[PDB]
Amino acid sequence: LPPGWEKAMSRSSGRVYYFNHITNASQWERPSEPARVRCSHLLVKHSQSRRPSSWRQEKITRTKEEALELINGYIQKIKSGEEDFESLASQFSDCSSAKARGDLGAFSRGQMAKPFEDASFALRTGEMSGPVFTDSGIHIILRTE
Ligand SMILES: O=C(CCc1ccccc1)N[C@H](Cc1nc2ccccc2[nH]1)C(=O)O
């Protein structure tokens, strides 16, 4: 299996699933290193973020837990095809990159917070993370290139 990925047993059905402890992705299907990646993301900030302010809200007061529920609800909508990533990033991301449908452009190792960077380099082009926590808040990361 590629970096980060482990096979596991689903507790509900008895079916195998796969999860990645670097990107927090999980999926039923069996899955599948670059110098640079291009990613977009959707940031949800909370009262404990480094800077609890954004273009959406002068004071961010939701808890970390409320931020995690928001993130989980956006992943559900993206995975079901109810909304696409770019639409939710534009409308709801607490990063100013929202204005570019979450696009951060291309970057190499040694530029972004570690947990964001590790998750980005562990995705393959096209794949999306689960909830990735950094000091900024909670992220959904889409690797575009
Ligand atoms: O650092 C920025 C701006 C980054 C950016 C890059 C390219 C285009 C637009 C913004 N904003 C932060 C929120 C934040 N924290 C991050 C950590 C990793 C990646 C993206 C992040 N975004 C904040 O406002 O606290």
Swiss-Prot record:
Distribution of this protein across tissues and organs: Expressed in immune cells in the lung (at protein level). The phosphorylated form at Ser-53 is expressed in normal breast tissue cells but not in breast cancer cells.
Chief localization: nucleus
Keyword list, A-Z: Acetylation, Cell cycle, Cytoplasm, Isomerase, Nucleus, Phosphoprotein, Rotamase
Record's comment on post-translational modification: Phosphorylation at Ser-53 by DAPK1 results in inhibition of its catalytic activity, nuclear localization, and its ability to induce centrosome amplification, chromosome instability and cell transformation. Ser-53 is dephosphorylated upon IL33-stimulation of dendritic cells.
Pfam families linked to this entry: Rotamase, WW
Gene Ontology terms for molecular function: beta-catenin binding; cis-trans isomerase activity; cytoskeletal motor activity; GTPase activating protein binding; mitogen-activated protein kinase kinase binding; peptidyl-prolyl cis-trans isomerase activity; phosphoprotein binding; phosphoserine residue binding
Subcellular location: Nucleus; Nucleus speckle; Cytoplasm
Enzyme Commission code: 5.2.1.8
Keyword presence, Cytoplasm: yes
PANTHER family linked to this entry: PEPTIDYL-PROLYL CIS-TRANS ISOMERASE (PTHR10657), PEPTIDYL-PROLYL CIS-TRANS ISOMERASE-RELATED (PTHR10657:SF4)
Subunit details: Interacts with STIL. Interacts with KIF20B. Interacts with NEK6. Interacts (via WW domain) with PRKX. Interacts with BTK. Interacts (via PpiC domain) with DAPK1. Interacts with the phosphorylated form of RAF1. Interacts (via WW domain) with ATCAY; upon NGF stimulation. Interacts with PML (isoform PML-4). Interacts with BCL6. Interacts with FBXW7, disrupting FBXW7 dimerization and promoting FBXW7 autoubiquitination and degradation. Directly interacts with RBBP8/CtIP; this interaction depends upon RBBP8 phosphorylation.
Domain notes for this protein: The WW domain is required for the interaction with STIL and KIF20B.
This protein's name: Peptidyl-prolyl cis-trans isomerase NIMA-interacting 1
Organism from which the protein derives: Homo sapiens
Higher taxonomy: Eukaryota, Metazoa, Chordata, Craniata, Vertebrata
